[PDB]
Paper text:
The protein translocon at the endoplasmic reticulum comprises the [name] translocation channel and numerous accessory factors that collectively facilitate the biogenesis of secretory and membrane proteins. [name]α is a pseudosymmetric channel that can open axially across the membrane and is laterally gated towards the lipid bilayer. Three factors are linked to co-translational [name]-mediated secretion: TRAM, TRAP, and [name] (also called SERP1, known as Ysy6 in yeast).
Alongside a RhoTM2-bound map, image classification yielded a map in which [name] is bound to a different and unexpected density. The resolution of the RBD density was sufficient for de novo modelling, identifying the sequence as [name]. The cytoplasmic half of the [name] [name] is hydrophobic and binds the open [name] gate as if it were a [name] or SP. Bound here, [name] holds the [name] pore ring wide, just as SPs and TMDs do. At its midpoint, the [name] of [name] is kinked 40° at a conserved glycine, and the lumenal half of the [name] is amphipathic.
Residue numbers in the entry:
A (entry chain C): 55 to 319
B (entry chain Y): 1 to 134
RNA sequence: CGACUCUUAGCGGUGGAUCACUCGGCUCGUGCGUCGAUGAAGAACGCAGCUAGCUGCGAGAAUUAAUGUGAAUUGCAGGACACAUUGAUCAUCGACACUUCGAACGCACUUGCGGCCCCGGGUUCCUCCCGGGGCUACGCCUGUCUGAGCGUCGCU
RNA sequence: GCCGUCGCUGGCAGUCGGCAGAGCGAGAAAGAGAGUGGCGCGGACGCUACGCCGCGACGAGUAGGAGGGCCGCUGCGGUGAGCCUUGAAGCCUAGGGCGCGGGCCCGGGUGGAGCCGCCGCAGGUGCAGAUCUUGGUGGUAGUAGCAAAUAUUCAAACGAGAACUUUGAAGGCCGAAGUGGAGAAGGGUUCCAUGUGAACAGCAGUUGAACAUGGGUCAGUCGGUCCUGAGAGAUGGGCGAGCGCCGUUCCGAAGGGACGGGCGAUGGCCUCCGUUGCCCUCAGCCGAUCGAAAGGGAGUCGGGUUCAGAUCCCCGAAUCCG
RNA sequence: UGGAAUGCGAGUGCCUAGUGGGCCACUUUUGGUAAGCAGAACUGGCGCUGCGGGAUGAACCGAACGCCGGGUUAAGGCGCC
RNA sequence: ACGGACCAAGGAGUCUAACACGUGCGCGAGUCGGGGGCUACGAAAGCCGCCGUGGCGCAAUGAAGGUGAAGGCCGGCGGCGCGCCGCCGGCCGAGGUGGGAUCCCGAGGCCUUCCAGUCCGCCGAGGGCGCACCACCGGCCCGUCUCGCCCGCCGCGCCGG
RNA sequence: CGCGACCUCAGAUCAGACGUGGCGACCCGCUGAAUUUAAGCAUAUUAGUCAGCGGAGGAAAAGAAACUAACCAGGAUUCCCUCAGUAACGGCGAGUGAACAGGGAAGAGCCCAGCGCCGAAUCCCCGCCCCGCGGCGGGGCGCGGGAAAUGUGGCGUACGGAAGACCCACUCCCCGGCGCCGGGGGGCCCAAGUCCUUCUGAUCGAGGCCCAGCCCGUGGACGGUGUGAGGCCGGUAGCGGCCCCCGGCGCGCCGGGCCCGGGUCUUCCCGGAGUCGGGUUGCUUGGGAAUGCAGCCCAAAGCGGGUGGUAAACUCCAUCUAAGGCUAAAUACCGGCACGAGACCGAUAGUCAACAAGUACCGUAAGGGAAAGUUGAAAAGAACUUUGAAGAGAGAGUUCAAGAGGGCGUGAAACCGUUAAGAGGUAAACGGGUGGGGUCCGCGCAGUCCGCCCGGAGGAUUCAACCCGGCGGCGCGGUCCGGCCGUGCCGGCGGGGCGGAUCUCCCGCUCCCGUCGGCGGGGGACCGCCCCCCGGCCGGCGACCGGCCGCCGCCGGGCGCAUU
């Protein structure tokens, strides 16, 4: 509040009365009279630099960079090492990216969704979301944030024909519409490599949404994929290649440690 | 997950509306499951507890197979008093121990015209749902 | 020797830090966006079987009626020949009710003085006394009634 | 010797293995070059390259700058198939340790329900001071002190308990401008009875104006009530953006009354009188209203009565007003 | 024959805090009787700085500082403390 | 010299705006949707493209009216008398000097029985193209000054170049 | 003199109405500082802001040009973005500071006076009858009353309007009653474990619940319950259900009202005054020879008047039409009613107020204004015995625990008591170096572990070598087959999408005569890129593989039966 600390008529006693010169509450007959006031060192005063509602809570991010971030998240979602390093139990998923037929977009019952995740071997990830369900340390419990749990697989669909209502009750699952992809959902915590299950229709729109290298995006007015700074990231293969190897001087791998000086005399 | 914009999931609001609930709302909050026999017979799962109902304690120190009559529904304290569910004070007098209705099972119902109406309504709304799924 | 003193530790005090809790705040957002002479906001004094405060209510006073609900309220007692279409309790709230002051209104602001009309009891038609009821404020609009003027005139 | 800083913008991708061949530190440029003619199945470690390794020099620091913190605090996104009633946080500890340090780990105890690691995000994020704020506690210290107004003593009672309470008796004081008996203002139940002896009454108390439980204030005649006082204050009017203010007879059609008379209407002890409506007649007050429990203002005294009220109750005797 | 010796890697650009009271000594030096006074030049100090010596001491003399072992010293010392 | 008897808890460079420079990322002579619109977490995110209006940048200069960012050679003619100016057609063309990381060529040279002569590499005097950047010299654009001779025409001008 | 009209003005407890006061976050009208900055200060700034006064509403105010402009013109008001920290103001210092255009949100337009024509064609109230009647109205009837010619109503208002004539076209539009058919508020209800072991004071904890995966799930929000719960209860989900009431939208009947329009000609008519404008004064603005407002003085015109951002004269132009009036929406909202949420605070914090807080308490008053949360799962809140006058104690008992005992969770430091140990004449404390003694730790006290080898005793799911099968690695298989496939290159009657400031047979509107030219909407061609089809080279499969063949390794099973 902009009044906190200021709803008093406190006034400084001034010097000469053997007390600090902090403004003091006027009147008498109660504990409050003659106490410090206003200052931020006082009990019941006003805090230092009171917080304001016009703090800049919101940030602009360039569209090209936001799309860049959606592309990195998707590229990092198709690599087993990164998805495993995100904690997802995908040791038995048949393939990555995981594409399932479009029938799944028409599921209605939550039991069909559960069975599909079991036959796709995405149920170990769900069982790991159940094991992570616990209470949250701190005041968050007092503020409607008592239960915490880890994210499960993301199901990305083209059109919703009951798939959302089928999956929404399974903990850890996040549904996403392929034409409205979110980096906050695709890279939870800012870390890439979330396990994503794709429907066939959703998978086929990706080229249109983001464009190939040869073809610009069809569903974005003017956009194409970010270019690469390094076409061959396999540093080991580059260094072991004959072309690089022929140009080098022979390595110097002999260690010449300090020599104890002995007196020649 | 809850989607109704006009239903609060706030912890403080939900506790305040529990502990300040009026008498006719505390009645609904003070509901007990029916036995397996009663549940089959009436197709109802829970009923608000009532004086002269016969219940089994299924949790706590007094749990067991003993069936006692409900002798007092202390809605203010959110407890019921049950025959023989009691202890003695220092001076030797016996005092009832309060059990929450959610920790007992109703084995016999105190039936009157209004209770038979409430059971009927619950059983009918249930069947509407079963046919809706079917 | 033993006091006293100092240091450390156990235990005991004094004290209320810390930690965990939160029916409270704070901030943002949404919908609505409604007081009064038919007497408001505010204030006073009352009202419970036992009741000081808070809360609620207004001499019908911790409430009446109605509607929903459906067996309690509860700290103790009690149960009106209170208790299931002879409806406990709570909720809602549309009926009825709502003391004194207060824009506050007969005049004053001390529970002071009136005035008019009607009704009842004393008495015995009026009077007179007592009681009850209804009126009796300022401004202002339309109209009504009663008037005023060496204002303008007309007929006498 | 060890630690760190700086420099060499030093070295290491060559862990090139039986598809093998181990070297490139040495004073002094550039190939351990390629070719054409004349038995065993074996061989340490390394390389989070933001890593690892070598060599040399160097190291003071206020004000001030910069870097690095696997320093610490709270919350948010992720992650740890993390921890936890077989015991969380917190707290305590002459227990064992780690780190230059900020700090942290483990053991034991108490505790009773939640908490932490790592990658990121965020900040109301780190106290010895500010005659800092609020709360608590010391020494001083069983200390200053409990010294204004002459004064107490004996016996008994109640009681656990008596210098202090009650009764009796002495010795004193206030000395009718009183330490007496009654009021005004103010207080507001302090009044009276009974009980308590926790807290309070700067010792104590069997006591109190404390606490608790219950009672107690009676009017034609005693005051208010009415009058006006100095004064205050509406209306008319004036002023004023306006809430309003000035003003109190001043720029006002300021009387709602009456003896009587005449016209009617209603009633009743219906005889005739009331009441009532209108008209005639008559009419200074000339300023609404407020303003005094000491001013003005009719009329109550004697006796008795209660725990506490009495010119008020009861008895008796009166009186004013209408 | 990079045209004296000696030593040393240099150049360049942005942004920038604190400071803007000083004081002391050898020598030079103004005013003043002089002052632990006031005011200048040069260099070095203290301020910001510990350490050995001057018993003690901002500035003197020696010497400048990571945590240690051994050796040796400076200025100063070696009756006893 | 001032504050500090003691203990706990609280206690002081923050947030908004503007600017400058440094750094990181995206795109790039462009870039930015921030306002608006479309389509539980979500007040999020996604999209717009005839929503890029608009901001900043891409042009400066002058008070302003305004103007607003290389040249040379060849051939021909007119005028003055081989040189100069004006108008015509063809060819080349964004300057130069010094320094300059890197790159390029390469006199000669990098051994093993001895000669010839090869392929791949490797070093190197000297010589070249010269990044960025700096210094210097030229040039171009706008204001202003001095000097001076011409060229244009729907307006023959106190016109325009 | 009397009577009667009118005018002006009175009194009524006359009949019926209406205003007052409050709240005030947002809104409109006034009035209106000084701290402050200028490193002083007076203009300026602070600021048209605080304070003061008045008046409202769910919004207010504003608003359909006496506008902007100067364009090829726009077109009420309000708001957002930008214009723009700009034009401008300013001891030209400090500082201040709009508009137009452009893009959006929203979008809505109208009515008088006047000038006229209509026999006042108009209005209010009373009385009676029908209808309705908690929004007091509709119709009918009164030689009922009044208002109003000092002007009511209908037509009509600058976009022009009226009357007449001629052509053309017209039957639905509303008011008051009555009946019938399809969002809001309230109430009640609707899935699944208290399954088997087990830990606990109690548990919602742990373990399990055949293939398969306890059960439900459109419900795994949250709260409660003796932890910690999707399944115990309330809830949550659902285009779920049932029951009340209110509203909205539709369709018919009755009684009323309107007797309704367009175009072309003809003739007529047309506007707001102590206001504009000017001078001056004061304030105000970015408004500068004066932006707005106000006082005083002067004081209009009618082809006039106003504006046209530098005073003035002359002259063209442009643009509006002042001095009367109404109007939703988009916008605002720290008050109120009812809700939802949060990277917020967590009892010295967060509101002063988590609690009998605007309370207790202080002040004559205006005003000032705190402290104060927590036993336990459950009061089971400690019966009874005993000492004491009692407070207090000792036992006993409840509880998982009173080592939780009614200001009781935990229970820190300072400070204090006691117990134990050590010590004590330079106040104590402190750095370095040892020494002595304690407390505890090593859960110490005949002292490590590992590879290979030698020897002695034993024992076997017994080694190599071969055979069957599976899998894996590699292959320059010197050049095997088949695949996908090139952010590769070539040849195509290839079957297509995107784009182009590259070119060009069909149609809509429109000028001119039925002709003929222009704007706009469409093929088609062409160019670039991309996708898919087919043929030829090279080429990957190390972000991208199968079959056979070969080599090698590993595993399972056989055989080897013992100098291994
Ligand atoms: Mg505060
Ligand atoms: Mg914590
Ligand atoms: Mg009472
Ligand atoms: Mg009732
Ligand atoms: Mg009822
Ligand atoms: Mg009086
Ligand atoms: Mg240093
Ligand atoms: Mg200690
Ligand atoms: Mg607990
Ligand atoms: Mg914070
Ligand atoms: Mg602190
Ligand atoms: Mg402190
Ligand atoms: Mg003493
Ligand atoms: Mg006296
Ligand atoms: Mg007396
Ligand atoms: Mg005492
Ligand atoms: Mg007394
Ligand atoms: Mg007055
Ligand atoms: Mg009086
Ligand atoms: Mg008197
Ligand atoms: Mg008498
Ligand atoms: Mg000097
Ligand atoms: Mg200094
Ligand atoms: Mg220095
Ligand atoms: Mg020094
Ligand atoms: Mg000396
Ligand atoms: Mg030494
Ligand atoms: Mg000496
Ligand atoms: Mg000082
Ligand atoms: Mg002091
Ligand atoms: Mg930058
Ligand atoms: Mg939200
Ligand atoms: Mg009246
Ligand atoms: Mg100043
Ligand atoms: Mg100053
Ligand atoms: Mg000043
Ligand atoms: Mg000024
Ligand atoms: Mg101003
Ligand atoms: Mg104000
Ligand atoms: Mg007001
Ligand atoms: Mg008002
Ligand atoms: Mg209102
Ligand atoms: Mg207007
Ligand atoms: Mg507009
Ligand atoms: Mg700009
Ligand atoms: Mg201003
Ligand atoms: Mg505009
Ligand atoms: Mg729009
Ligand atoms: Mg007219
Ligand atoms: Mg107009
Ligand atoms: Mg259920
Ligand atoms: Mg279980
Ligand atoms: Mg739960
Ligand atoms: Mg729970
Ligand atoms: Mg379960
Ligand atoms: Mg349910
Ligand atoms: Mg529902
Ligand atoms: Mg007008
Ligand atoms: Mg002014
Ligand atoms: Mg001004
Ligand atoms: Mg001009
Ligand atoms: Mg208006
Ligand atoms: Mg507190
Ligand atoms: Mg507080
Ligand atoms: Mg506290
Ligand atoms: Mg705290
Ligand atoms: Mg407090
Ligand atoms: Mg506490
Ligand atoms: Mg315990
Ligand atoms: Mg405890
Ligand atoms: Mg508890
Ligand atoms: Mg406590
Ligand atoms: Mg405690
Ligand atoms: Mg101790
Ligand atoms: Mg001792």
């Amino acid at each position: 509040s902009e009044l906190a600390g200021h709803q008093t008529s406190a006034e400084s006693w001034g010097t000469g009365r053997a007390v600090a010169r902090i403004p003091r509450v006027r009147g008498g007959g109660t504990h409050r009279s003659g106490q410090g006031a206003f200052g931020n060192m006082c009990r019941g005063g006003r805090m230092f630099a009171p917080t304001k509602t016009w703090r800049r809570w919101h940030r602009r991010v360039n569209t090209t960079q936001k799309r860049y971030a959606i592309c990195s998240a998707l590229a990092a979602s198709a690599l087993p090492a990164l998805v495993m390093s995100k904690g997802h139990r995908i040791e038995e998923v048949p393939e990555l990216p995981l594409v399932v037929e479009d029938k799944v977009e028409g599921y209605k019952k939550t039991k069909e969704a559960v069975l599909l995740l079991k036959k796709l071997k995405a149920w170990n990830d769900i069982k790991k979301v159940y094991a992570s369900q616990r209470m949250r340390a701190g005041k968050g419990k007092m503020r409607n944030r008592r239960r915490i749990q880890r994210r499960g697989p993301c199901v990305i669909y083209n059109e919703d024909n009951g798939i959302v209502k089928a999956f929404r009750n399974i903990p850890g699952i996040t549904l996403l519409n392929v034409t409205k992809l979110n980096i906050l959902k695709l890279a939870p915590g800012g870390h890439v490599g979330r396990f994503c299950i794709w429907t066939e229709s959703a998978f086929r729109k990706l080229d249109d949404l983001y464009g190939t290298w040869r073809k610009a995006a069809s569903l974005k007015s003017n956009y194409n994929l970010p270019m690469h700074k390094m076409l061959n990231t396999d540093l080991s293969r580059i260094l072991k290649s004959p072309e690089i190897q022929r140009a080098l001087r022979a390595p110097r791998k002999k260690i010449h440690r300090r020599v104890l000086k002995k007196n020649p005399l | 997950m809850k989607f109704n914009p006009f239903v609060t999931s706030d912890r403080s609001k939900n506790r305040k509306r529990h502990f300040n609930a009026p008498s006719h709302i505390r009645r609904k909050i003070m509901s007990s499951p029916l036995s397996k026999e009663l549940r089959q017979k009436y197709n109802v799962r829970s009923m608000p507890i009532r004086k002269d109902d016969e219940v089994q304690v299924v949790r706590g120190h007094y749990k067991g197979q003993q069936i006692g009559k409900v002798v007092q529904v202390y809605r203010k304290k959110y407890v019921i008093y049950i025959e023989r569910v009691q202890r003695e004070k220092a001076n030797g007098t016996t005092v009832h121990v309060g059990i929450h209705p959610s920790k007992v099972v109703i084995t016999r119902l105190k039936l009157d015209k209004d209770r038979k109406k409430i059971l009927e309504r619950k059983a009918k709304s249930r069947q509407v749902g079963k046919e809706k799924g079917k």
